[PDB]
Design a protein around this ligand. Structure first.
Ligand SMILES: [Zn+2]
Ligand SMILES: [Zn+2]
Lengths: 48, 138, 98, 125, 40
């Protein structure tokens, strides 16, 4: 019933070890890029 | 003002000879270079090509104070000659021929990414995720 | 119409087609130019204003028969005839003895 | 907050790096809790002018009313209309057409451009 | 006549173009183009 249908999402950063816990100089995943990987995946993969 | 009122007339000469060849040295306006900051300059033909065709190498304020590379334009008198017009104390104008056009551009200092030690290989593995760390490892 | 009389003068004296080209009353035209020109079918009817849906015409055909080839030019009123028969004639004309 | 507003934030497609004219890239300052923009090849970096850094799925607007200089009006093969008043200049000779493109425009509706000097206006009715 | 002011034959006749047509073939010919490629 709103002015427009919008859906805003977040990654579930579960407080604990998801905070540079073991370094692993790899950068497990940058945020910015990860929003794009999900969105790339979100549009292209999911069949509702 | 005089830009909107003054009316003058001056004589023009085109001498069949000069004591020095005249060239154009062009800069990008977007850089807005302060020529006052140029305490000194060195100017030499570029060494990559190892003469008259050689691109210029301009070193201002020392070897690494400021450095530009000048690349010759394709043509300068292919259809129309270019002249330098200079004002003389007698008010008369003097015209000088443009021999050549060189394009001058700015040049980053020390940085050095080899892109040959393993970076050509690393690209094959690249996930676009890192780039800084290789620069420290050198 | 006087230029026609010049064309008539050419039978004896001279008035070259090139001069007609030099006259610039006609020009030679490619398909790229055709995309931009407003071509006319006929001088007569199209110059009429009474029913001028358009009058922005830029050029006109010499004659619609100019589309035709050597073979099609032989058979009269091809449009009162079924179209392939003409292609068959165009082939068969080539097949004729003479 | 009402179903009568619109979303024209004026997205910032790009900003060149003053050190190299290369594109600046978003980044967070998790220490200052602020968005920043940086170039990769150099150390040049600068704060962001807005929280919005991205937009997606396009073309739901009237493109055909844009990207059309009135100079089309000089084409004689484009029909004038007897319909007067250049939405600006009090003169007829409005040039008209559909969208005539890719969306080729199921919109078969005429779009009007006056050809009269001193207006250049592109509209439709 | 030519007064260089008006067209005295706005009904320039359809048949005159045939005078124009014969003049085309009189100059240009038919297979002329084939020679032109070879000649240049
Ligand atoms: Zn930069
Ligand atoms: Zn107008």
């Amino acid at each position: 019933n709103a002015e427009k249908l919008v859906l805003r999402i977040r990654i579930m950063n579960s407080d604990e070890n998801k905070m540079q816990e073991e370094e692993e100089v790899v950068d497990k995943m940058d945020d910015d890029v990860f929003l794009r990987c999900i969105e790339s995946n979100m549009l292209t993969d999911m069949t509702l | 003002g005089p830009s909107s009122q003054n009316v003058t007339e001056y004589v023009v000469r085109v001498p069949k000879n000069t004591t020095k060849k005249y060239n154009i040295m062009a800069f990008n306006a977007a850089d807005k270079v302060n020529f006052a900051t140029w305490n000194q300059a060195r100017l030499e033909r570029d060494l990559s090509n190892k003469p008259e065709d050689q691109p210029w190498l301009l070193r201002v304020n020392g070897k690494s104070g400021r450095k530009f590379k000048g690349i010759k334009k394709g043509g300068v008198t292919e259809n129309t000659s270019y002249y330098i017009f200079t004002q003389c104390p007698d008010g008369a104008f003097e015209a000088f021929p443009v021999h050549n056009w060189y394009n001058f551009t700015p040049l980053a200092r020390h940085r050095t990414l080899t892109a040959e030690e393993a970076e050509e290989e690393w690209e094959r593995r690249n996930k676009v995720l890192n780039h800084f760390s290789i620069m420290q490892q050198r | 119409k006087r230029h026609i009389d010049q064309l008539k003068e050419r039978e004896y004296n001279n008035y070259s087609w090139q001069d007609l080209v030099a006259s610039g009353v006609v020009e030679y035209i490619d398909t790229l130019e055709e995309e931009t020109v407003m071509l006319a079918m006929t001088p007569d009817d199209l110059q009429e204003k009474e029913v001028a849906y358009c009058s922005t015409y830029t050029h006109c055909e010499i004659h619609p028969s100019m589309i035709l080839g050597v073979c099609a030019s032989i058979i009269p009123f091809p449009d009162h005839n079924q179209s392939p028969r003409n292609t068959y004639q165009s082939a068969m004309g080539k097949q004729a003895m003479g | 907050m009402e179903p009568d507003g619109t979303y024209e934030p004026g997205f910032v497609g790009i900003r060149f790096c003053q050190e190299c004219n290369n594109m600046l890239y978003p980044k967070e300052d998790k220490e200052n809790r602020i968005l920043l923009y940086a170039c990769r090849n150099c150390d040049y970096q600068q704060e962001a002018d807005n929280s919005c850094i991205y937009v997606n799925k396009i073309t739901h607007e009237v493109d055909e009313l844009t990207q059309i200089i009135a100079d089309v009006s000089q084409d004689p093969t484009l029909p004038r209309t007897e319909d007067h008043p250049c939405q600006k200049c009090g003169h007829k000779e409005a040039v008209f057409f559909q969208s005539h493109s890719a969306r080729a425009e199921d919109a078969m509706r005429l779009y009007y451009v006056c050809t009269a000097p001193h207006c250049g206006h592109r509209w439709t009715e | 006549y030519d007064e260089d002011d008006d067209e005295i034959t706005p009904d320039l006749w359809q048949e005159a173009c045939w005078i124009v047509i014969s003049s085309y073939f009189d100059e240009k010919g038919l297979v002329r183009q084939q020679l032109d490629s070879f000649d240049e």
